Paper text:
Although a classical G protein β subunit was not found for Gpa1 in C. neoformans, Palmer and co-workers reported that a Gpa1-interacting protein, Gib2, could function as an atypical G protein β subunit13. However, based on the amino acid sequence analysis, Gib2 is more closely related to RACK1 (receptor for activated kinase C) protein orthologues than to G protein β subunits. Hence, Gib2, a scaffold protein interconnecting various cellular processes through binding a myriad of proteins, could also bind with the ribosome and function in ribosomal biogenesis and protein translation. Apparently, although not essential, Gib2 is important for growth at the mammalian body temperature and is required for full virulence.
We determined the crystal structure of Gib2 at 2.2-Å resolution by molecular replacement using Asc1 (PDB ID: 3FRX29) as a search model. The asymmetric unit contained one copy of Gib2. The model includes all of the C. neoformans Gib2 residues (314 in total), except for Met1. The electron-density map is well defined apart from the first and last residue, as well as a short stretch of side chains between residues Gly276 and Arg282 in the extended loop linking blades six and seven. the structure features the predicted seven β-propeller fold, with an overall shape that resembles a donut of approximate dimensions 45 Å and 10 Å of the outer and inner circle, respectively, and 30 Å in width. Moreover, all of the seven β-propeller blades are arranged radially around the central axis and comprise four twisted antiparallel β-sheets labelled A, B, C, and D, starting from the inside. The interactions stabilising the β-propeller fold are conserved in blades one to five. The network of inter-blade hydrogen bonds between conserved residues observed in blades one to five is absent in blades six and seven. Deviation from the conserved structural motif in blades six and seven might be necessary to accommodate the extended loop located between these two blades or possibly provide a more dynamic binding site for protein partners. Although the middle portion of the loop seems to have a different conformation in Gib2 and Asc1, the knob-like structure in Asc1 consisting of stacked Pro276, Phe278, and Pro28729 is also observed in the Gib2 structure (consisting of Pro272, Phe274, and Pro284, respectively). Although Arg57, Lys62, Lys87, and Arg102 (Asc1 numbering) are not fully conserved, they are mostly replaced by other positively charged residues in RACK1 orthologues. Based on sequence and structural similarity to mammalian RACK1 and yeast Asc1 discussed above, we propose that Gib2’s positively charged and surface accessible residues Arg36, Lys38, Lys57, His60, His85, Arg88, and Arg100 contribute to the interactions with rRNA.
Author numbering: 2 to 314
The structure:
Amino acid sequence: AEHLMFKGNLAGHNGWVTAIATSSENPDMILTASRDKTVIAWQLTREDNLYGFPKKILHGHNHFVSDVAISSDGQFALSSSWDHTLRLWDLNTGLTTKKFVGHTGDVLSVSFSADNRQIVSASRDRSIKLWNTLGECKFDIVEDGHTEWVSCVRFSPNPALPVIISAGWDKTVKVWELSNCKLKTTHHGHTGYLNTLAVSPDGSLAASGGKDGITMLWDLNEGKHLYSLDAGDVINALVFSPNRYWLCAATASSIKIFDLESKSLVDDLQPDFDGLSDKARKPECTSLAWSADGQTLFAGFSDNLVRVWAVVV
């Protein structure tokens, strides 16, 4: 029987866990970003009492950390912050090697290209910027750009159509051709602002989500909308499983796991909140990541914890 099985918590942050990153290079490590202004590198022990412990606490941002990524070689962390900057960290030394300065508003998203030669980020300043790995901004994508905050930006891993995808508070999803940085497609359809966006491991699908409870799937090869899945509530985070045809949506109320083959619901994760139900709103899941091999789901929450589920059968 295959299904997510609660395995434990990672405790250590002192603010909402806002992003989680994972890599094949070290499967025993997790990176988490937080409103406590730190990134933590966790060592996973997978023991029953502690699933893991914080191994390194990366200090330096002056405001909420909003997103984090790991280099393909697993040795560098890349994070964005409401303090207007990105930072590249050496995970061996735990120090920042490069600061990316240039945005003029809160940075809400950051990501590595497949080959790690390019870095892309999105900000409240309504721009998308491309950097190199030395911290130099190489292009400012504004033309025909979003007219509100840009909340999430990602690369397509499809070698044939090199694009970046962005979602914004203008309720649209935009596809940009990477070669010249010109707008390729604007997708309309969402009725509310968007928090998040994820791309298929084969780069055929993009999923977008936000204030309307609806996650919409867009065909990156062809023109347009494919279908929509109704999550129950405001969508905080979206991620595709790397090794199953599944799409997970973290909402205010729950974590829904959608089977894409059937459009059916695989699971609805609602953790037992170790506290109470007295004049208190159940903590929201604010971030999601799969392990590289797709056997472990990590979920960050507004009660400062990471919660871990292990695919069982």
